[PDB]
Amino acid sequence: MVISINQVRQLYVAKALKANTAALTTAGDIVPKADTAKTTLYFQSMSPAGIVASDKINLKHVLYAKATPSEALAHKLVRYSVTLDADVSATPVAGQNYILRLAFRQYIGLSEEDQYFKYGEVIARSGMTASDFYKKMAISLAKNLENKTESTPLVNIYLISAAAASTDVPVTSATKESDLTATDYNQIIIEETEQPWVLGMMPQAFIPFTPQFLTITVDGEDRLWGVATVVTPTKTVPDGHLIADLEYFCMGARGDIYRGMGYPNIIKTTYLVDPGAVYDVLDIHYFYTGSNESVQKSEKTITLVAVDDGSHTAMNALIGAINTASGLTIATL
Amino acid sequence: MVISINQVRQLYVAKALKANTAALTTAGDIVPKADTAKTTLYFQSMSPAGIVASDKINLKHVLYAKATPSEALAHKLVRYSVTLDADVSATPVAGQNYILRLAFRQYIGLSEEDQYFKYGEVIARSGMTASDFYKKMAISLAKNLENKTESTPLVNIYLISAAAASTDVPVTSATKESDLTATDYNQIIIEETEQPWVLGMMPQAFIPFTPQFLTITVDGEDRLWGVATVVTPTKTVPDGHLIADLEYFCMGARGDIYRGMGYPNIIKTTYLVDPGAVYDVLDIHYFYTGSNESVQKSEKTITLVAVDDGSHTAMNALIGAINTASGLTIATL
Amino acid sequence: MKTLRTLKISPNAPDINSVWLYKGTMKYFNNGEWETIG
Amino acid sequence: MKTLRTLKISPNAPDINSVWLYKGTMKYFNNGEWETIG
Amino acid sequence: WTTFVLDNNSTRVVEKVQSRLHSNALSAGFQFVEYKAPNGVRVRLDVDPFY
Amino acid sequence: GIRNPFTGQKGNPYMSFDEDSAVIHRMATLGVCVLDPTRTMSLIPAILQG
Ligand SMILES: [Mg+2]
Numbered sequence: 001m002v003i004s005i006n007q008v009r010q011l012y013v014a015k016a017l018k019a020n021t022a023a024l025t026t027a028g029d030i031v032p033k034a035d036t037a038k039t040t041l042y043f044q045s046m047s048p049a050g051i052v053a054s055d056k057i058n059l060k061h062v063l064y065a066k067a068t069p070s071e072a073l074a075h076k077l078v079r080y081s082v083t084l085d086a087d088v089s090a091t092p093v094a095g096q097n098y099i100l101r102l103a104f105r106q107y108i109g110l111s112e113e114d115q116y117f118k119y120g121e122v123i124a125r126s127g128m129t130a131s132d133f134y135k136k137m138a139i140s141l142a143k144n145l146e147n148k149t150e151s152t153p154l155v156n157i158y159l160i161s162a163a164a165a166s167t168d169v170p171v172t173s174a175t176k177e178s179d180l181t182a183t184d185y186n187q188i189i190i191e192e193t194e195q196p197w198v199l200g201m202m203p204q205a206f207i208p209f210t211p212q213f214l215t216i217t218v219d220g221e222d223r224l225w226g227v228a229t230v231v232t233p234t235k236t237v238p239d240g241h242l243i244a245d246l247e248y249f250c251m252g253a254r255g256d257i258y259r260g261m262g263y264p265n266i267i268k269t270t271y272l273v274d275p276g277a278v279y280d281v282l283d284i285h286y287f288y289t290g291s292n293e294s295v296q297k298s299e300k301t302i303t304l305v306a307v308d309d310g311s312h313t314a315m316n317a318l319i320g321a322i323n324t325a326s327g328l329t330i331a332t333l
Numbered sequence: 334m335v336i337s338i339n340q341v342r343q344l345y346v347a348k349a350l351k352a353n354t355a356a357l358t359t360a361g362d363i364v365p366k367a368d369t370a371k372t373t374l375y376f377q378s379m380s381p382a383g384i385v386a387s388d389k390i391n392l393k394h395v396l397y398a399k400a401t402p403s404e405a406l407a408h409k410l411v412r413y414s415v416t417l418d419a420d421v422s423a424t425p426v427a428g429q430n431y432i433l434r435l436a437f438r439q440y441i442g443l444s445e446e447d448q449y450f451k452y453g454e455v456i457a458r459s460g461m462t463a464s465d466f467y468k469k470m471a472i473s474l475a476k477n478l479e480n481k482t483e484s485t486p487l488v489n490i491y492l493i494s495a496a497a498a499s500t501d502v503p504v505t506s507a508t509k510e511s512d513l514t515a516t517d518y519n520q521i522i523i524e525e526t527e528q529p530w531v532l533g534m535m536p537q538a539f540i541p542f543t544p545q546f547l548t549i550t551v552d553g554e555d556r557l558w559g560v561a562t563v564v565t566p567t568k569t570v571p572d573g574h575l576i577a578d579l580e581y582f583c584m585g586a587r588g589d590i591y592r593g594m595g596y597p598n599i600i601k602t603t604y605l606v607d608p609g610a611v612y613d614v615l616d617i618h619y620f621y622t623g624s625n626e627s628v629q630k631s632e633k634t635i636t637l638v639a640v641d642d643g644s645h646t647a648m649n650a651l652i653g654a655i656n657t658a659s660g661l662t663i664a665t666l
Numbered sequence: 667m668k669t670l671r672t673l674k675i676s677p678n679a680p681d682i683n684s685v686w687l688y689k690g691t692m693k694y695f696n697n698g699e700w701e702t703i704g
Numbered sequence: 705m706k707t708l709r710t711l712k713i714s715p716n717a718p719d720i721n722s723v724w725l726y727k728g729t730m731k732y733f734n735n736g737e738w739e740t741i742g
Numbered sequence: 743w744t745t746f747v748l749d750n751n752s753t754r755v756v757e758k759v760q761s762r763l764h765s766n767a768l769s770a771g772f773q774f775v776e777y778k779a780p781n782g783v784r785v786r787l788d789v790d791p792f793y
Numbered sequence: 794g795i796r797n798p799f800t801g802q803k804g805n806p807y808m809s810f811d812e813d814s815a816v817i818h819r820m821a822t823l824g825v826c827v828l829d830p831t832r833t834m835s836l837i838p839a840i841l842q843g
Contacts, residue, residue: 087458095678219459219699220682221428296810427698441831459698476842484830506842551697553668672744673708673723675734681744687708687732692741704742 001203001245006285006299011250012045012054013272014306014318024051028272030304030318034059034325041326043302048270054302057286059326063299067282067319069333070308073242074278075204076233077192080211082137084130085227089218092124092133096216098225100137102145102190104154104209116207118154119144134159134185138171141188146173152196154207158189189231197241199275200248200259204241240275243305247273250303278308280315282330334536334578339618339632344583345378345387346605347639347651357384361605363637363651367392371660374617376637381603385587387635390619390659396632398663400615400652403641406575409566410489413544415470415521417463418560422551425457425466429549431558433470435478435488435523437542449540451477451487467492467518471504474521480506486526488542495519527570532608533581533592537574576638577608583636611641613648615655615663670694708732 003009015028024031027048034041043054082100084090092098100120107116120141122133138159146153158168162184169180195205215222248271252259256267273279282304287297306314312333319330336342348361354377357364362379376387415433417423425431432454440449453474455466471492478487491501495517502513523544530537548555581604585592589600606612615637620630639647645666652663674680675687679700686693686700693700712718713725720733730741750756755772775787794813796803827833 217679219427220679220695221698294811296812298812422697429698457698473839476839480842550668671709673732674744675706675708675732683744687734687741689734689739690741692730 001249003246003249005253006301008253008300009250009303010055010253010301011247011303011305012043013247014045014304014314015272017317017321021051027270032318032322032325034327038327041322043304048272055300057284057302057326058288059328061289061297062284062286062328065282065284065328065330067315067330067333068280069312070239070278070280070315073239073281075206075237077194077235077237078208079192079231079233080190080228081231082134082188082190082211082226082228083186084133084225088216088223088225091130092122092128093216093218094124094126094128096218096225097121097123098133098137098216099214100141100226101212101214102155102209103212104207106205107154107207116154129183131183131185134188135177135180135182138188139175139177139180141190142171142173142175153193155209156191156193158191159185160187160189162186191235194237197275199244199271203245204237239278239308243279243281244271244273244275246303247271247305273305279305280308280312280333281305282315282318334533334575334582336579336582339634341586341633342583342636343387343586343634344580344636344638345376346580347378347637347647348605350647350650350654352654354384363639365651365655365658367659374655374659374661376635381605388633390617390635391621392659392661394622394630395617395619395661398615398617398661400613400648400663400666402645402648402666403572403611403613404569406572406614407569408539410525410527410539410568410570411541411566412525412564413523413542413561414564415523415544415559415561416519417466418558421549421556421558424463425455425461426549426551427457427459429457430547431455431457431466431470431549432547433474433559434545434547435474435542436545437487437540439538439540440485443538449487453477462516464516464518467521468510468513468515471521472508472510472513474523475504475508476506479504485528485540487540489524489526491522491524492518493520493522522564524566524568530574530578530608532577536578537570571609572611572641573606573608576612576614577604577606579614579636580604580606580638606638612638613641613645613666614638615648615651617661617663 012030013028014030016026016030018024018029018031020031021033021044023029024044024046027046029046031044032041033044033053038059041057041059045052045054084092098121102118102120104116104118105112105114107114120137120143122136122140124133138157141157145155145157157171159171159180160166160168161182163182168189169182171180190209190211192206192208195207196202197204211228213224213226213228216225217223248259251269251271256269258266259269260266283301284304285299285301287299289295289297304318306318308315316332319332322328323330323332345363346361347363349359349363351357351362351364354364354366356362357377357379360379360381362377364377365374366377367374371392374390374392378385378387417425432452435451435453437449437451438445438447440447453470455469455473457466471490475490478490490504492504492513493499493501494515496515501522504513523542525539525541528538528540529535544561546557546559546561549558550556581592584602584604588602592602593599616634617637618632618634620632622628622630637651639651641648649665652665655661656663656665670683670685673685673687677688680686682695692703694703695701708721708723710721711723711725715726717731717738718724724731724738731738732741733739753772755770757769759767759769761767776785778784794808794810794815795805796813797805797815799815799817
């Protein structure tokens with residue numbers, strides 16, 4: 001992805017905090033360096049081609065310094081629950097055609113004017129129970145959706161039985177009626193699906209949607225047959241795919257700009273952030289004011305990333321070494 | 334506001350009683366002066382810039398002198414109880430649209446032909462009780478009549494439960510359906526509201542209305558649905574706005590006839606009445622005639638305004654000073 | 667005063683302005699629901 | 705779906721496309737026979 | 743559509759034909775090839791014998 | 794500063810700063826009057842009020 005900057009953005013990867021220079025030997029180490037009077041601050045980081053010392057931060061000229069606990073960057077996959085409401089009818093009316101119009105948006109487009117629609121249809125019967133309706137609607141949902149042989153589908157359709165109430169039965173296009181043997185289905189769950197992601201060409205995007213209903217008639221009036229309520233998400237997307245795209249852009253504010261354009265003749269810039277782990281972020285945003293005529297500030301920022309083991313340990317060791325050497329008070333998370 | 338006069342009307346504020354001319358120290362004073370042979374009466378009031386007097390009331394030529402309390406100058410905000418007419422249907426029927434029209438009669442203008450019609454409507458469902466109807470209709474009426482968009486306050490809408498039967502709960506456009514949690518609602522009361530008021534430029538008026546019901550079809554006949562009966566009012570508007578506008582008009586008789594017309598250059602009459610305090614009004618009405626063939630009289634009046642505390646201490650002390658000094662039998666209120 | 671011109675035999679709810687004739691029931695629309703005769 | 709439009713009062717049975725009314729008995733043509741409503 | 747009664751002067755489901763058997767001899771038959779939905783959506787039939 | 798990409802002017806007699814950049818600035822003033830709002834009626838769904 002491409003981002004917006006305040007005239008620069010420099011990113012450095014923190015894999016292991018050594019104590020000082022001549023201890024940085026492996027690729028990805030870092031040590032925050034400062035002087036004894038706490039005037040300037042810079043990060044000596046080991047690039048895989050040698051020690052690369054960062055831009056010197058004048059400590060009187062810092063706007064903010066804040067860190068991110070790496071759970072504030074995880075996207076939550078929204079879940080909708082499709083139930084027959086007790087206001088209209090708790091049982092399927094024996095003659096009515098139940099059509100569920102999923103109203104997707106932003107599909108293979110960038111705007112909300114690129115809208116897509118997928119469906120699911122079950123016409124009820126005389127001895128139609130409510131639990132067999134949620135079994136038959138989800139299979140008919142898994143035929144209009146979930147049929148993409150080429151790519152992974154738009155949404156994930158689940159079924160929760162009332163005897164379990166916390167474990168969802170997966171419904172796919174291979175699933176027939178005989179595979180779902182429970183008799184106590186009470187809802188259908190339409191979860192979002194993590195879209196494909198390649199490093200530096202396609203960003204992490206999502207296709208939002210809203211399950212919409214078509215009108216059935218019960219007492220001679222056209223009523224909406226079900227309700228679509230959003231429950232709290234249970235499956236999240238980790239931080240590996242956003243941070244690796246952030247290193248892809250802010251390594252071009254320091255090094256190679258031609259990131260695979262003339263394909264045989266490129267400069268292969270090795271990337272240090274791997275997409276298979278979550279990553280904390282620490283940001284330091286500062287400026288530079290010159291002497292006697294050049295009072296204008298050339299604002300800058302320095303981004304540090306460290307691997308998160310859940311307990312925020314590797315970032316807290318990095319903030320704990322900056323606050324000692326530089327003297328700033330960054331909030332340890 | 335602008336009032337009509339019997340050839341003059343002049344006001345003097347009785348903020349204090351000083352009983353002689355030498356004690357006229359602070360503004361708003363009054364001294365009812367009369368001689369030992371009771372033939373002429375006048376009032377020495379302290380203007381903000383000196384001592385002024387009234388006209389010499391000939392005590393044989395007074396016509397009436399009647400003092401009114403503050404509770405005779407308060408306009409009671411009229412109410413209207415909206416209920417379900419049980420002769421039509423005690424319960425809301427399962428299909429019809431229940432629309433209620435509010436027919437205002439003086440919108441913006443002074444005539445009865447400048448009407449205004451607002452509406453509130455509920456689609457009644459099966460199983461809806463009488464109290465669930467009043468919960469949905471006082472919300473649908475509040476989002477029309479008590480929103481943050483309307484230029485004028487139209488009506489104030491309250492609900493009355495059956496357990497309290499007197500205590501009103503306020504509903505507004507921000508009132509949600511979970512705020513009203515009571516299954517014993519028996520009426521919806523629609524009360525008048527006081528209008529915004531600017532001293533001397535925008536008078537005190539109100540917008541009277543009539544809740545009119547639209548017709549619903551019970552059986553095969555369209556039975557006008559509801560009944561709306563008047564209730565004895567509870568909230569009254571204060572007196573101080575009518576008396577702030579009464580001095581502003583009556584200072585122009587003894588002063589400059591124009592008040593701000595042409596503003597580089599005005600003579601600023603400084604007033605002494607508070608619009609947030611309730612007052613009492615005493616009106617000595619008299620005339621003038623000379624001993625000749627000109628038997629035609631020139632009617633006049635003098636308004637006195639004293640503050641009201643609920644027990645009428647200042648006005649009865651003002652009446653009791655006029656009665657002994659001048660020899661007039663003004664009724665102590 | 668409320669005219670119904672036609673009658674529809676159906677296993678479903680036919681229309682608000684018609685008579686629903688099932689096997690042994692005659693339902694018609696009244697007060698927001700289907701009132702059976704007899 | 706079979707739409708009945710007319711009601712006929714006769715001592716004998718009318719056609720299959722009309723409702724039969726006699727002496728307090730409603731009958732219409734269902735399941736090949738005349739079926740009583742009540 | 744209980745609202746709109748479908749008569750014979752506009753649908754013409756039976757038509758007068760000319761035959762030796764009778765003077766007022768009548769045909770019978772109709773078919774729908776088009777539906778016109780609200781807001782301008784018209785659907786027209788096309789039958790390919792490949793299908 | 795030195796060059797102006799909005800026009801193509803390499804060189805500068807009157808510099809604004811020294812950081813070799815260029816900022817465009819635009820301003821406008823607009824206004825809409827409605828004389829009488831009682832001559833426009835409206836039906837809005839109640840999920841659009843807030
Ligand atoms: Mg308007």
